[PDB]
Amino acid sequence: HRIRITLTSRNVKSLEKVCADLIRGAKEKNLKVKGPVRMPTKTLRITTRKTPCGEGSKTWDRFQMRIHKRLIDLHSPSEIVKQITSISIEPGVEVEVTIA
Amino acid sequence: GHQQLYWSHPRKFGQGSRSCRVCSNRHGLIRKYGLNMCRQCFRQYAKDIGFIKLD
Amino acid sequence: KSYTTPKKNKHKRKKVKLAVLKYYKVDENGKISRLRRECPSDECGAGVFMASHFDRHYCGKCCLTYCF
Amino acid sequence: MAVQISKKRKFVADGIFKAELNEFLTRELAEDGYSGVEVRVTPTRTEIIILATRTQNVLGEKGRRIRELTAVVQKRFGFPEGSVELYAEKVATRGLCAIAQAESLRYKLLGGLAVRRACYGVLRFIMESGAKGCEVVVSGKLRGQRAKSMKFVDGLMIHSGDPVNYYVDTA
Amino acid sequence: MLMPKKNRIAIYELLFKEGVMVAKKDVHMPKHPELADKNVPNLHVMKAMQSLKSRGYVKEQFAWRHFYWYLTNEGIQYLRDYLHLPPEIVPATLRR
RNA sequence: CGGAAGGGCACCACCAGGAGUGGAGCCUGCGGCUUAAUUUGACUCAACACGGGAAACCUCACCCGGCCCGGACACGGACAGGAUUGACAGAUUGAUAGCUCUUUCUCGAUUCCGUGGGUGGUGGUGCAUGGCCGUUCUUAGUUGGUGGAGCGAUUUGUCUGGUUAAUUCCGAUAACGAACGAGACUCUGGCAUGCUAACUAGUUACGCGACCCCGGUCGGCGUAACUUCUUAGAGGGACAAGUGGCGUUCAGCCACCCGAGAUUGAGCAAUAACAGGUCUGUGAUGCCCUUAGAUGUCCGGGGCUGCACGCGCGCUACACUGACUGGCUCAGCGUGUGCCUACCCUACGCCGGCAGGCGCGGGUAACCCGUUGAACCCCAUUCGUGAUGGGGAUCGGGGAUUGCAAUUAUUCCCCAUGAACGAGGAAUUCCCAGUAAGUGCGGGUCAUAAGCUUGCGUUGAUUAAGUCCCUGCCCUUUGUACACA
């Protein structure tokens, strides 16, 4: 009954639109909903030299990937979860649902 | 024979085991987060794998 | 380019015309004589023959040395 | 899952999966108007859609080539049988797709047309397609051994700042 | 080019049931990722389907590490003469 | 372009300074030398801890050697009475490479022998090129259409003046309408007890437990409210907005109140150009060269580190502001079990001084490391100006880890040896706010691995709010016998 849903997406507004969409979908069925827990993000720092050879001035890149994760807790069996999670999903968001 | 001297060198460690997955060179390899690809090929595909130069 | 040390030639493989004719000796009766041995190896029961070297017998491809 | 790698390695491996496919279809479907791919992640179903200009020319002999492209993903990436499927979809306003026009200019140069005359023929098509401006540069050696750089530019076209990442497309 | 006949008639059969098959560009590899059941050394098989191209029965494509062998319409009839298979059976990409 | 003039600007310039280098040791790269090879690219800014190049093999492109075709394909034979493959032995050898000499077994149209031919090349050519990067140029500059001028190259717009970091605007005006760039825009920082939310984050209360004399503490234990401390999302907030002055009173500028900010930092960045660098990044490549006794593949060893000398970036000291011995007490960026991949980060409990060795678990990661018990800092001894307990170069002996392999000491630990160096000449580098400087911690290269580099965090200032004096940059005028300027 204590089901965890993991919301990971690279885009900020692709994750933000689906994190509130599951709130709208679940509140129609009117069960116990926990709020979306905002946990600190992970950013991917890569710094490489711009010149393909070793000639010229020393300049460096700043290549980044910020990844965000949101956790929403549901107090429901898996029948309700399997219905809503198939509606309005976009490939930028990777959704992991844990029954336990 | 000839099979005993062709790939008898141990290549389970070091910089000779790893090479780029596009250029197959042994320099500038980004082993970080298991890209296993050189820095030079990292650039033209940086948008493709997904890094953005944000700051 | 030019080299000082002479090269190494290719090994001459001993091509034998009618090479199977020496394994058996034909007899006018209803029998066949096998001068060579029969290898007890698992991969080859009794058909594959073995080398008759100058020093001792040996079965070639199976890499199994036998001594008298 | 089996090896259960971290989420740091999960999104890194997805990017290389996208990047290797992007190198692949550029080298194989450029003659029939390849314009990009898009993955649709679903449980046990991996839908990847080939956004192509000429949808007629990519399906081939009764959809043989699309079925050929399915078997490539099955074997190189080790996906289970029936787990990944491919579709070809039409690209709206294909004149505004630079990678679709880059191979169009590439084949006009390769067909034997003049360097200049191939360049004008694309440019009045893309303003006919509704573009505010463009920049076309052909490098290399022209009319001799010495290298010359062409620059035949018209219209509104910016370079600097944030908007260049989504207001222009470069091939 | 003496990788023995036990290793041949499988890979044309392998190239028949799927018209295209993959291979990691790596000479020093005893096996295949796709064909992990048989020994089938990688370096000899690299010389197998390039000889298919050498008369012109197969195409070639590359993705950073990988030889891709798309069978041409000439290649089906070569497989019918070499393997003596009936003309009714078709590759999986020719069936829908 | 001017050692011509007038304006404006810059710590890759100065002023006033700070830390330094050059002075000593050591590390690293280059030149030179030498070697079989000490592979090579790069030589003012814009080469010299730069090719992410911290080379035992590989990397390696070099040398000494030794094997193989991985010469596909098309064509002439040779061929199943066999075209042709591997093989344990004796010497060969570096390897038990059938690689070769003797000597036979073995596979079976695949093959081998010649010609075209293709492949391979870290072979040459960046003064043939693609692509990428750097520099001109961090400056504010650059261009079209129409109209005007001149036969014309060209010019007006793109400006006399004011203002600005800005071709930033105001204002004039044979110029007008416009376009790139700057600005604008993206990320970060900072202020909101206002909104959303948290049992992988905590706070407050209840009830205990332990201790001390009702109260106090506990990373000791379970509960209900909350986001003040933890996180990230939507909004807000700052605009020269208000005031006093300067200014055509326009553009705008200075000061002050109020307010977390009355200039945070970085990204992006225009036209044209170098014959700048990269073919040794490529299954990017034109052309030239080799291709079977190969400039192709692979294996053993060496080398790229070699040392009369010079130079460049750096680390450690020359001490008492300190060295040593104890005790005390604080961080944030991050990262961590691999498609091939054979290799992760660590709690806790034992053995050994230590390097390290052995057991169990946790963590695919707000969960475990971790509350990251960091240096620095603070307190208390010894030393006593002594090349001294500064300093740790050189060097001897021993013990451990990774690796198939450490000798030319791979690294780590213990004892011992204890050099120069007493604040560094000519000359030269960087910087004005959490900045410099001091100091440690993450990531890269890593099997073994930071004197480098990339970020983070701690302690934390002196000086200056100006200038063209030098070095240079942007306009206007002027002159030229320069135009590869």
Is B55 buried (19+), middle (13-18) or exposed (0-12) by CB count in 10 A? exposed
User: Using CB atoms, which residue from E33, E63, E96 is nearest to D20?
Assistant: E63
The torsion of the CA quartet D124, D106, E59, E77, rounded to 10 degrees, works out to 40
Q: Where are the beta strands (DSSP E) in chain D?
A: 34-42, 45-52, 84-90, 133-136, 152-155
Resolution (A): 2.9
Instruction: Count the domains in chain B.
Output: 1
Q: Residue B35 and residue D9: Cβ atoms within 8 Å?
A: no
E61 CA, F178 C1': Å apart = 50
What residue numbers bound the domain in which B41 lies?
1-55
Strands A37-38 and B37-38: unpaired
The rounded distance, in Å, linking the Cα atoms of B30 and A38 is: 31
Strand F nucleotides within 7 Å of a protein CB: 41-42, 46-47, 50-53, 57-60, 66-70, 72-74, 81-89, 95-113, 122, 128-135, 179-188, 196-198, 200, 230-234, 265-273, 275-278, 281-284, 293, 295, 297-300, 333-343, 364-366, 402-405, 443-448, 453-455
Take residue B26 and report the two structure tokens written for it: 């042994």
How far apart are alpha carbons D110 and D57 in whole angstroms? Answer: 20
Give E62's contacts (C-beta < 8 A, 6+ positions apart): D27, E68
**Nearest residue to A66 (alpha-carbon basis) of D34, D84, D152, B53:** B53
Strand duo A66-75 + A42-43: pairing: antiparallel
Gyration radius (Cα) of chain D, Å? 19
Are E28 and B22 in contact (CB < 8 Å)? Answer: no
The approach used to solve this structure was cryo-EM
Give the whole-angstrom CA distance, residue D40 versus residue D46.
6
CATH number of the domain that residue B20 is part of = 4.10.830.10
**Are the C-beta atoms of residues A87 and A36 closer than 8 Å to each other?**
no
Contacts of B29 (CB under 8 A, 6+ apart): B15, B18, B19, B20, B36, B37, B38, B39
Backbone angles phi, psi at B16, to 5 degrees: -85, -20
Backbone angles phi, psi at A57, to 5 degrees: -75, 155
As a whole number of angstroms, the distance between CA D54 and CA B6 comes to 49
**Pairing label, strands A37-38, A66-75:** antiparallel
